[PDB]
Design a protein around this ligand. Structure first.
Ligand SMILES: Nc1cc(CNC(=O)[C@@H]2CCCN2C(=O)[C@H](N)Cc2ccccc2)ccn1
Ligand SMILES: [Ca+2]
Length: 223
């Protein structure tokens, strides 16, 4: 997260870190057994880390649970990032508490202008590299479809939305991939892609979760 702020420990209790020897992506806990992340975060050997603030120190509220299965969306296209969503099943159910909590799925799509919360442990620099240990947060509005398409001509599908600031300076970034965009208490977006981080006229692009609720519900009912 570039241009954001320190969230405060466990104030984003649905945020997960995906670990394969090191943090590589975020995700969102949607019930005690399932995490939503980005399809571009797929890899084998995932451990889900819940209850994290400092990802380099055991602070006492974590739960570390291996994934038993990952399900990338059947229509994910890794060239266009259309349908950039993946479900991860936990080998055992998380113990839900004030520091480890699920985030609701949306029942309607969020509106342009709505302010959302984006979070993660990704790079905090727009030029150069610095990775934080504690969770970072950014408040950002959903942008109009026309401004999103003008920023990324020929690249925005109906399964994507832009959020952020056309002036630059505030954005998600590498390492925030797969993490949540929460608006009105619902998971409306997944950190997906952008052209650099926090660059002028290049806001973040996010998977539009409301288009996937039927797939998520049917998949978790059968796996
Ligand atoms: N708001 C954001 C969020 C992010 C997080 N996402 C990434 O870092 C992803 C992971 C793979 C690379 N990438 C990019 O977004 C590439 N720039 C484009 C690209 C995409 C896919 C393959 C190659 C290139 C980055 C930037 N602004
Ligand atoms: Ca920790």
């Amino acid at each position: 997260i570039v241009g954001g702020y320190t969230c405060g420990a466990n104030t984003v209790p649905y945020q997960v870190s995906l670990n394969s020897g090191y943090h590589f992506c975020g995700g969102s806990l949607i019930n005690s057994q399932w995490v939503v992340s980005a399809a571009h975060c797929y890899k084998s050997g995932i451990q889900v880390r819940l209850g994290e603030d400092n990802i380099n120190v055991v602070e006492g509220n974590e739960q570390f649970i291996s994934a038993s299965k990952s399900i990338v969306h059947p229509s994910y296209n890794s060239n266009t990032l259309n349908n950039d969503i993946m479900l991860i099943k936990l080998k055992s159910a998380a113990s839900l508490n004030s520091r480890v909590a699920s985030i609701s799925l949306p029942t309607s799509c969020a509106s342009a202008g709505t302010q959302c919360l984006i979070s993660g442990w990704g790079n905090t620099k727009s030029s150069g590299t610095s990775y934080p240990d504690v969770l970072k947060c950014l408040k950002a509005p959903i942008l109009s479809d026309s401004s999103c398409k003008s920023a990324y001509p020929g690249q925005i599908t109906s399964n994507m939305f832009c959020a952020g600031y056309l002036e630059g300076g505030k954005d998600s970034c590498q390492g925030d991939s797969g993490g949540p965009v929460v608006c009105s208490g619902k998971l409306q977006g997944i950190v997906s892609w952008g052209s650099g981080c926090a660059q002028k006229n290049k806001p973040g692009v996010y998977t539009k979760v409301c288009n996937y609720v039927s797939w998520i519900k049917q998949t978790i009912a059968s796996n």
